């Protein structure tokens, strides 16, 4: 196990009493269709259900056998046409499927049916997953459409195959040998992702190179186009707004001035003439040194809808970033919020603006971004961050289910309650129907893909969650860990509460009870909670946590920058008032004393240090966990795994003493004696701030 | 096949009725030792004839069965000491071997004797080769010994991981999981470079970053040097000179400074204490803007034997490279030669002078390097080239084997006849203390390691070389298409063929009769002959060329920098007589009329211009060749392989293209009709030159 097949390992179901049950079940692989995506299915189920029945079943066309597993729709599988399905199959759409034990002509079947090619396929893999996961096909009936339309993962590649944050390798795309070589790792990056239901994918970075425009670059990126076709993802890129400049063929990129309207037209036009099903651009403008509208003085959504116009013909749609803050201004936490809201209905129904989590960077915690809750005629999509910025790179231990369950079932109050991040992601709170997730998860050519074996559990819950934002961090973890390592109870139960406290641990001794933006800058990789004096302020770390000797913490209640306000009421009442506020965010709202009480009992110096030594012995509780299933794990990955959490600790402790350290010496209070004492000093861990091997190939 | 084992594909024998006899004669493996090395001899027996016999055989220590396989040296394997083989095996040394067909208390068997445990190491693998390329185990009778002492490979790769003229990948080291993780990957990649006899590696970049040095680095590289160890694998490491200055410890690097010599004696026990039979050092210095003693006014043996002097209480070595030219100098092809030889006797007895193969930068073709000829008081070693830095990057088929033997196989009358650049590096021409060989092999993180499938032919060639350096570049792509590919003669043939005119395929489409350095600055993806006004002229390509209206070349004789000078009289003579110079180094030492007639009977327009297109002719064959190979490979290295030869012939297109109109341009001469016309014009390609995707993560500063 080198981690290759992700979660996708087709071994023989080890329960023999389950595996005799599905050799029963499923003797036979009937498909009527031929298309190219049935086709993917057909391969898949051929050899998931070889590999995990371990008999050959092979993928035929012919006469009805009993118990028999049968895909189709009913255009191109006659034996599911004749079961009349009919508001059963309706409810599915254009992506569901329907999964079902049931009877053709008297034979046993299972069926896999859905209205198109694209829903068999999802379907298909489902099934493998309930054989996957050991669950019991008798008497199954389920039916399943996800909750989102653009379900999309982004990569931040750049053309020399350096991945900005990106802990896995060099970029999976091989633009030397492209568009020649058609290399099976693209049909095996598009299969992981159809596993998910993932239907789109960006594969260059935002900080965008206008070389992915040109037709050398487009018939490199047409190959991957169809590869990934049968596999129902289309293709995206991100794009530089001054791409019109970059061409020489025009002096100017403002998005009012027809030759620029005709420059993105024409060069649509020879996008969908090699991608006629392309799905569309991403775009960061206006945003740390990328170019945009507002560099000609106009604002986002005239730089956006001209996109827009280009794209509206072929079907190709916009996602324009709200990730967007100026150095000038107050208060970053209030900036993408202030930048768009007057903007609300301005943007053309092809236009979906892509927000993060968060309002300020994919930071360990961070409360919703209030343009989820203002932002009512606006088409929006969500954004995480699966690649490990800030959780550790490739050596932190970091699931991220539970900070994409927290964001997702977040209540917000912007229309009653149920007005949950999920609900509004969904179109149901504001009414749109143009809806989405995107993941930035930034693989590599690392013979597992992420790097840590761990961070294909943050994919995993990534796009599980795309197709239903309510499935739980729990659920998703409980299905990865049967896919990816064992079956087994024992294992599954203790590696499944390590993961679900992993992500809490990378709050705990990095930035806890709403600290925020320590690293090390600009590379992320260690603490430097001191870090100030940089160009921009909002780049700095003092700048958040605003330390002194009687207290810490940033007022953002009507008293300071008054961001709460940019929320709906109930939630700027919950959070303004401390009786309410929850301590994992208050201090992104309040300054507080050091003395200020925290629910403990312990006040907040005694707490922030309590919370720095939790992280590192909640570290040191997953070492002791892991290395309890030794006999559940293949040996390499066993030791790989053992071996990174070593790094991880000794990381954690750096982290944790360095924060410790310095807070310390802002606040002028001793660490309460029954810790242990860092043995060195406060320069002591400034300098292995300066010394500490980053390890990234990219740097900023 | 994703081509992760590389020629170490331990699959069961497709011959029938050899495998049979391979399955008769090999029924069991008996070990006795259990060092580390014959501990990891053992295991790749092991992995190795139970794969190619498809068999269970597992290595024990029990009671002598018949048939079986004993490995050992006299001193850990009784039953072989019990034979006597004395001088014979004696002869041998510390790193040789006898592998035979005996007999032992009237038991049959095979044996794998050595004086050493590494010895029996590298003998098992030649024992496991032999199978592998379907060699008669009957009546076996062979020794070897390497001809070699440091027989090494060299990795420019930056901490970063980023890989400097790296076509393959990330770095192979994980600095961020290091120590803690001894990822598979390491053992892996020393059994590569064990199997051909490989002893050293040098891991990082020669331009040197001063951090490898510091304790946090020499943590991490220790474990990689315990994963290297049972394979006879030292490690080495490139030296950034001014280290005492950039770790703040002493205000200068003066070699003479008692306080410098001081730093480097402390750093050397460090080392040492983390890693006890460390190499040694690399070192690239006063070059390319490294620091070195000439930036102290002092000489290069002032420096290299400072660091000699700290590495020698420990059996340290220092590899001194002479890539070394001044900007200043009139011609860059004398730079070296110019630089070592008022030297040569200082240096100290544990520096060896690490030399390219020729004066310029690992071109397609070039002259041999003046140094080896004339340095007659100074430890040399060869340094080649493997990773395709001037012959294509990861999208080229260039097997560099041919490349690697003209050079070693060049006579180069040093001591008259028989001072062939091979039996210099061995010692027998000048009579010396330490030898060996270094391979610039920058593979990486790429599944298959060096991205093209046939780059790992010229790794293969290069380490079978470094053990003897009469190997031919036939034999080596030989047993490498046999371990790689298949045993199928009508596949071995015409594949080994393909490979053999690849490299002069590299030649004539970038660069044929003696010109030189043509390429892109300074990523030396593709053509640009045009190039002129850099901040160094040694770094343009009118320096190397000279073209004009009437004539091109380079004028090397005594009429012109007087270069021929700098070799035996033999060799001056030679290439400085029109009449008896070859016609592939014409130009590296003759400005010649572009109306010089030529061997062939056209002029020198007309020969350049078929020499351009004999290239593009070569590469079109290399694709006819590879596509009638599809029912012996698997399909996914034929479809790889089908893929890149499309992207090479499309580049070599682009590379005759922009060479010839160039030439054109400067002499005014027309393109023969016979000659399909290209495309396009020159100033088009001087835009592709600006336009075409340079398809390598490191860039040049
Ligand atoms: O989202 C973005 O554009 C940026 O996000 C930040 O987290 C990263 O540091 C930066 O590399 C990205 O370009
Ligand atoms: O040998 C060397 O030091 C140099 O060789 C040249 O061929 C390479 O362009 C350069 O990257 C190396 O540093
Ligand atoms: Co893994
Ligand atoms: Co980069
Ligand atoms: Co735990
Ligand atoms: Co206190
Ligand atoms: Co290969
Ligand atoms: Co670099
Ligand atoms: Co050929
Ligand atoms: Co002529």
Not at 459 to 471: E, L, T, V
Request: with cysteine; proline share 6%.
């Amino acid at each position: 196990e080198d981690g290759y097949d992700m979660w996708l390992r087709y071994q023989p179901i080890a329960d023999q009493t389950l595996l005799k049950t599905y050799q029963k079940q499923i003797r036979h692989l009937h498909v009527a269709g031929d298309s190219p995506t049935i086709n993917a299915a057909a391969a898949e189920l051929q050899r998931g259900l070889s590999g995990l029945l371990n008999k050959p079943i092979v993928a035929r066309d012919e006469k009805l056998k009993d118990y028999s597993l049968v895909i189709g729709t009913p255009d191109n599988s006659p034996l599911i046409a004749s079961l009349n399905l009919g508001e059963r199959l309706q409810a599915l759409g254009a992506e569901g499927y329907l999964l079902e034990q049931t009877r053709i002509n008297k034979r046993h079947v299972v069926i896999v049916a859905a209205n198109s090619d694209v829903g068999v396929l999802y379907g298909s893999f489902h099934l493998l997953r309930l054989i996957q996961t050991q669950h019991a096909l008798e008497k199954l009936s389920l039916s399943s459409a996800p909750r989102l339309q653009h379900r999309v993962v982004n990569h931040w590649d750049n053309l020399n195959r350096v991945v900005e944050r990106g802990y896995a390798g060099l970029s999976l795309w091989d633009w030397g040998s492209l568009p020649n070589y058609l290399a099976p790792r693209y049909t095996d990056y598009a299969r992981i992702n159809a596993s998910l239901g993932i239907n789109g994918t960006v594969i260059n970075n935002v900080n965008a190179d206008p070389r992915v425009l040109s037709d050398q670059f487009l018939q490199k990126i047409a190959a991957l186009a169809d590869a990934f076709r049968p596999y129902g993802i289309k293709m995206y890129l991100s794009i530089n707004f001054n791409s019109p400049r970059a061409f020489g063929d025009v002096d100017t990129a403002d998005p009012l001035d027809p030759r620029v309207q005709q420059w993105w037209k024409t060069r649509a036009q020879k996008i969908y003439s090699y991608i006629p099903d392309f799905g569309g651009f991403l775009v960061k403008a206006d945003s740390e040194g990328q170019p945009g509208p507002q560099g000609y003085g106009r604002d986002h959504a005239e730089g956006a809808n001209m996109l827009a116009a280009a794209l509206k013909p072929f079907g190709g749609v916009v996602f324009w970033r709200a990730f967007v803050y100026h150095p000038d201004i107050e208060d970053r936490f209030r900036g993408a919020y202030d930048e768009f809201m007057p903007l609300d209905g301005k943007f053309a129904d092809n236009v979906i603006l892509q927000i993060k989590n968060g309002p300020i960077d994919f930071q360990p915690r961070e409360p919703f971004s209030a343009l989820f809750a203002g932002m009512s005629r606006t088409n929006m999509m969500m954004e995480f961050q699966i690649t490990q910025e800030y959780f550790g790179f490739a050596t932190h231990l970091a699931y991220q289910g539970p900070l994409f369950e927290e964001s997702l079932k977040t209540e917000t109050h912007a229309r009653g309650e149920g007005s949950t991040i999920g609900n509004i992601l969904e179109g149901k709170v504001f009414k749109t129907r143009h809806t989405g997730m995107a993941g930035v998860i930034n693989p590599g050519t690392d013979r597992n893909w992420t790097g840590h074996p761990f961070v294909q559990s943050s994919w995993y819950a990534f796009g599980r969650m795309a197709w239903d934002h309510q499935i739980s961090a729990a659920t998703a973890a409980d299905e990865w860990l049967r896919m990816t390592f064992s079956n087994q109870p024992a294992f599954i139960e203790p590696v499944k509460q390590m993961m679900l406290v992993s992500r809490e641990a990378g709050v705990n001794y990095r930035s806890p009870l709403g600290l925020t933006h320590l690293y090390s800058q600009g590379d992320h990789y260690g603490p430097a909670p001191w870090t100030d004096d940089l160009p921009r302020a909002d780049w700095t770390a003092v700048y958040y946590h605003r330390a002194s000797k009687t207290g810490i913490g940033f007022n953002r209640t009507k008293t300071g920058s008054n961001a709460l306000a940019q929320y709906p009421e109930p939630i700027a009442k919950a959070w303004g008032d401390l009786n309410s506020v929850p301590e994992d965010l208050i201090l992104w709202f309040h300054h507080l004393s050091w003395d200020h009480r925290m629910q403990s009992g312990r006040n907040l110096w005694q707490e922030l240090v309590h919370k720095y030594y939790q992280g590192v012995e909640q570290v040191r509780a997953m070492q002791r966990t892991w290395d309890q299933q030794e006999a559940y794990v293949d040996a390499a990955r066993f030791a790989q795994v053992k071996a990174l959490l070593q790094v991880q600790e000794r990381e954690a402790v750096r982290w944790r003493n360095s924060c410790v350290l310095y807070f310390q010496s802002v606040a002028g209070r001793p660490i309460p004696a029954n810790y242990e004492q860092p043995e060195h000093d406060l320069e002591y861990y400034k300098m292995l701030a300066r010394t500490t091997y980053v390890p990234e190939p990219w740097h900023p």
